[model samples]
Target: DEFQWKGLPVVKSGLDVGGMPTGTRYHRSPAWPEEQPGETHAPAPFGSGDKRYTFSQTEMLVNGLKPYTEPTAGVPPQLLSRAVTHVRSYIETIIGTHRSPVLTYHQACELLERTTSCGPFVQGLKGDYWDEEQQQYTGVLANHLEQAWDKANKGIAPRNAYKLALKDELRPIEKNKAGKRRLLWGCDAATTLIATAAFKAVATRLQVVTPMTPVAVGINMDSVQMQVMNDSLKGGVLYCLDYSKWDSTQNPAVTAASLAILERFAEPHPIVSCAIEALSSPAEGYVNDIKFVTRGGLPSGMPFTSVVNSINHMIYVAAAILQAYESHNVPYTGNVFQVETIHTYGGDCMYSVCPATASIFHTVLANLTSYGLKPTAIKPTNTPVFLKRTFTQTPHGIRALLDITSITRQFYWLKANRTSDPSSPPAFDRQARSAQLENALAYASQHGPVMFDTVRQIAIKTAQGEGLVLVNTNYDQALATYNAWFIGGTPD
Candidate 1:
């Protein structure tokens, strides 16, 4: 309460958040400055030069609160009160359903195992691609893809293939910036393991969900998000993939190998078998009108690596898979996911875990068949919704649901001490977290279902592991639905 920056207060204090990395560490919560919003507004709050901070009509209402408030210049306060009252009531209704229906930690663990099991079934990295025994990826890329590249280009190495293919196909190609690439480095291999562990942490954090929580994801819709949630719950996480990781980050040979292994091992590993199985029940699991993007982009000065190589690696993997398809000739309507080369040198590219209730894995697989990118089984994750100005009526009047993304964001930030700042790497030990996650998995194997809140507290008390983030775009629909209940005219 005493601290101030340029006159405004900067309160940084301790909370008894026991399960955190440091017990009772200082944190910054949503706070207001000394002056009211009308005066002395700083450019950016909490350090970045002081303080800082759009919605559209026809946009979904109850999406969530916009960070800024619109001025109700001539609007009556009573109507405003009524609008607020409506929103609160709708929020309360959804809150009632959130408590009991939750997936247990043990079930979440099983989901993780199910996810990992599907790794080998992925298209390009299918079958024996993953070395389960040695715990390190072998051929697939170095030997297998080398042969593919050789045969495809008549033994012309990647260096020459780049130019010949460019002239032969009349397409653009970039200079090979990375130079003669070597085998995958320990750091490169380390990325896969680190990414996988982070996936487990995120999956566990997202496991707690309400009965109707829906997952929203993108382009590469692996079924892992479906597998991670309650078997009966609807919706699943859609993973975002970044294609830039391959543009020049690693040698084509080495890049292909690392990615082959990443698909066979990391998060969002597609379940090829499940995608085919989805043909039988496409109508049930498939739902449209849903989309999501990673919450924040690369931090400043951070290259478009995966979420720090973890950010968009899924997209990179997608590009690789597409390339593999083009290499072998998989029937498809769309142009192959391509690399850029016109102006410069070589490439370009593109492309959740959190399962909803029910076996959404298959449905997710079915939903994404158009891309020719089949789900092999791997698995939101973060989404922003637009709140409509329209109002919905309930017994409580103009009601609206609170965005659960906001709720889950807070939960993960608080419970797991996850950074709300999307730029920063997630705070967890590279080595220790996997071990902690495994311990929880083992515990789940032996124990029965525990209540959601109880499980969270248990994790804290026992120091078992980090909990779920609880983001669900499907729940935001409840808000939209409630907000749609128009009692009468606009609140204004």
Candidate 2:
């Protein structure tokens, strides 16, 4: 019979057997097939000469480049080629040495049998049970790594090595704001939304709150995803199957079908196999468990962060649809409401706008409570709208200000016949003909020739869609801000 385990606020269930709730040994999941579906889910032909991956925007840039319409620019082609090579190399390096052996088929099965007694305990450890000292519930890998380090290193061995190496094995609070708060899947998707918030600010409630950071100046989706993604996260491959998030129709079968989920990324790496072997029968939990620490001391076979991110996306989708229904159900004057989730992640949902019929955006975010989804809005108090707030010193504000400044700088130089320094008197030259021209100049200067050329080329088609104006007249200050972060002049 199954026993109910209620220790914390959350409800948990496990079978009461052998003086323990029947548990699982291996928390590790299997990898999702690459052939699965997603917008970034394009797979090259199986028998491949050269493989092409289709990430939203940043994926293609990081993986490889097919430079065409041949023309050389300021930074050489190979510079970025090598830069992106490093980008790809970093992932390859981390995964190549993720150093876990439990992922083997047998090892995984053994874990399933052994940890059957205390699996729920492990789950509680991951999601709840915070170590106040670490400010995280992230203990599985830490304890795993410290003991492993002691076992591996001889200097600490004869004595209390496990306790000594404890600090070294723990993942530190990240230096960057986003890194400090978000890991793993947090950085995964956003190149798709950067543009969503930028162009739709006036018409829609879409606000990709990445609003500009020091490292990124504009709604450069690639910048947000690729450039800033460096060394920020280290984690193991995942295998997950979770879909209890959206609000489906009345059809039970359809609802069950709507819960369609069975996927994992980064599963090919070795650490996955290692988890079950050591922990399956922990006669030596201290020594062999070290093998469980993976790519940046991440928990073995982790799918929690991925599950949260995945379910969050679905809830956002459901919330948007629900809001649309709510708008009509509530009855507004126009009989029309354009509601959608404009942006999300990093604790910011630059959620799109709603008809002034009633405040549904708050309800939108507040709605996703139980089933593991809660979007903590920066502005949770007021009208509960995802309306864009300008340079207010908030992270979102700074990002907005920075990007707005970058946009105007693009125009500042483009329209200004005089080359003028906000600090100094005005100097003059013909500005760019299009924001595309200026954007490429700035983008290339900041990123590389590849980015410059790519932006320049895309502007021909995509730029036509933009109607940019220097709305914020903070010219001098904005210019100072732009120059402070300007990368074009430097060959660095």
Candidate 3:
């Protein structure tokens, strides 16, 4: 009789001893056995039972080989715990958890010491702490003064005690008071110079300062009063004088002193230059506002053409200035160019040429021109005519027809009357009249394409890209379209 011996597989053969064995005498087991004969089993080594296994089915299906491949999952939880603990300990040693705050200062020496000694000074310390409630890291404020002092004196004895003493001696109130005193002294010096000038000019009398009005005497005694009075008394005579008689020579000392005071007070230098310029420049040309071409006539018969011409000339001058300045790269320090036309309405026909209309026309023209420089033409809208006769059968029909016919007849009559009237001849019928005016305007607009363009062109040329033009036409759609154009958008 032959005997067969069954033993665990050899480790060198890469066979796991715990795995099911395979051979002719020993068959592989689908599940682990309840007990092994003649073998005492101790508790599985730590994490041994938790191991995972895999096998390839190809060998079993195709090659008819049992247990063709086997793969295991990761180590058990107990082994993983040990490995994680080791890694954590290693990381902790390399990078400690302790962190310090950050500080900065303007002064190099103070920054090195982590301290500030000047105004608007700031000092603080920050730290990180684990928040159990939030389960996250958070910041914590510490004894800021002590921390700052320690950082500043890292290599030397802490001078926190000395700094605290100094802070106590220089209270915030004392510092504020010093600043206030300086401001008050400056104001007093300015007031004194103005007061001396005012007294000399007999415009102001010296008086004690009062809380209600500390500079009341100075204001009352302003030398400008005498100068204004003299100007008014002499009328246009003062305009012709040279700088010598215009306070520049009469009160040279006071003028010089006042300018010096202004300089000391930091008044804008350009303001003085503007004042001098205004004094040096000649008076503007005059125009009569009340003068009219014909009294109580349609078309206003006002001499607004002159006003329009003047405005056009003003625009030309402004353009010249702009061109010269740009061509020569000269700085522009003048006020915005402005043209004002004043008018008086003596009759219904003249009302359309009133100052208000002039203003509106000027505004419209400015908006329509490319350079915010253009002429504004204003004329009355009134037209007069005689009522014509008409026939109607019924009494009610007659009354209504009379009213309607009167308006229609007047419109036609005025056109015809103006055409025939020798004093102010009309050139066309009602419809033709309107066409003629439109054609004239079209021609004028074409002559200067800038007049037909919107405010966008003006803004682009003037370097005021953000500026806008508005028309008070009271037309909703027109307003919307204008706004769209102003913002660089096309109207839908």
Candidate 4:
């Protein structure tokens, strides 16, 4: 016969012994991969060839370019060349002393296993035991995954940095979804950071307008991606005099060399107006996305399509401007730009119809009725949906009510001194335990209660067959019901 061990369960289960299994039993998990994948091949060496663009060449390409009056197709060849050059140059600069900028996937595993700063890979795993006399349960929580992940990923770069491709059709087959094939650059984390940092540094060095603050901006993909596709169809498209095609590049060091090269651009270039900020929600270093925004704006009286063409044109100019002071041009090796226009905007979408700053409540009505569809008028409420509770009702209160220290002491005593041992039962007195609990409650009251969300949105990791169940709180629907009942208001 086996005894039930009611302590916190360690996820590893290969420690069982005998027929009845003393500890947790071993079982194969589908989540564990049978074999790990190999690392990607190191990128080819760079910075050995003649430079692709000089200062004058870049200035001429960007400054002389005109917006398309007629629709066009395919990317400008010269612009694509500039992208290849900039991306490759940045990669070369970042790989500086290292044989390769990117760490092999195997290396990441090694680093992770050898590192304690990464924290427990799994977070928010709660374990609890019922206090029979008190008729309650209690537990502790960990809340530093974001900080821990960053500490683990610092000083490393990612691979497959960028690619360039174009849309096939000038017009969209569906809303914002065009079947297109041509060349446009889709940049990943390392590449995007390099690009962003270069522009900000160049702008600051040149004493231009302070590189715009990191503000949220909407990407009208229909305007930015599809417009470029159509503009490429117009007559008299400019092609690069020296180079052709865009290729995918890999792994850039986050370094000062990127900024040094960017400084070669014109004093007040549009690319310098650009800024990119990393998203914080993923709480991982290897997340490969960038949010690009710019201070550059279009001229008055420009047609709506001009908004589209201008955006694409500026991107070309931006690429052209990001060139080496030398003429070394490495031919690029891949082509693809991720393109889609169906509302890529999420995580707090942006404003509508004509930028309104002052007293726009009435002004927007005219713009909405004339140029855009009128939106439904639903005003937000001023009243609070849930009132903030006092210290006596939060985590500290619960801890005191459960008498955590006393219960834990009792639990350990039970574990060590079995009933058959005939040891005197540990005194189950409440006064001393309650005295400590009273001091804890008083100190917590002075300091205020530990703050956290009692209710949370569910997250299910389907691949790992794991999930986080909300704890120390009533079921989610019950909380919502209580909110409505106390507030006595219509439910949103």
| TM-score of model 1 (CA atoms) | 0.17
lDDT (10s digit) by residue, model 3, range 337-440: 21111111111001112233233343333332332222233333222110111112221121101233222222112223211111233333334533332222
User: 1-492 in candidate 2: lDDT tens per residue?
Assistant: 322112111111222211211111111101111222111211111111212221122222111111111111211233223322322232233224232211222222222222111121122222233345554323563354334333322222111111000010111213111111111111101111111111122111112222311111123332233222221211211111112212111112211111221111123222322211221211111111121111111111222222222222433344333554454585323211122222333123333344441244445444343222333322422222111322122221222122332332232222221111211222232232442344334433332234334434433332343333321123233233334443233221
What are the lDDT scores of the predictions, listed in order? Answer: 0.24, 0.24, 0.22, 0.23
Query: Cα deviation of 353 in candidate 4 (Å)?
Result: 17
Residue-level lDDT of model 4, residues 186-288, one tens digit each, is 3332322322332333323222211011111222121222223223322321111111111110011111122223334423322222211121011111111
Tens digits of per-residue lDDT, candidate 1, 1-492, equal 344322222233222111101111112222211232212111111111111111121121111111111111211234223323332232234333222222222232232221221111122322244455454334542343333223322322111100000000101112112111111111111112222322333322222331112212121111222222223222333332222323223222222222232232223322211211211111110001211111111111111123122212223333333333334565323321111110001121111222221123344334233222322333332321112111122343322223222222222222224232422334543345334432333222111223223323433432322333211112233233323322222121
lDDT of 2: 0.24
* Alpha-carbon runs more than 4 Å astray in model 1: 1-315, 318-320, 323-334, 337-492
Q: Tell me, by lDDT, which candidate is best.
A: 2
How many steric clashes does model 1 contain? 58
Q: Candidate 1 vs candidate 3: which has greater lDDT? A: 1
What lDDT is obtained when candidate 1 is compared to the true structure?
0.24
Error of 4 at 8 (Å): 58
Please give the range of 10 consecutive residues that has the lowest summed lDDT in model 2: 160-169
Better of 2 and 3 by TM-score: 2
| TM-score of predicted structure 2 | 0.25
RMSD after CA superposition, every candidate: 29.7, 25.8, 45.0, 26.3
Which one is best on TM-score?
2
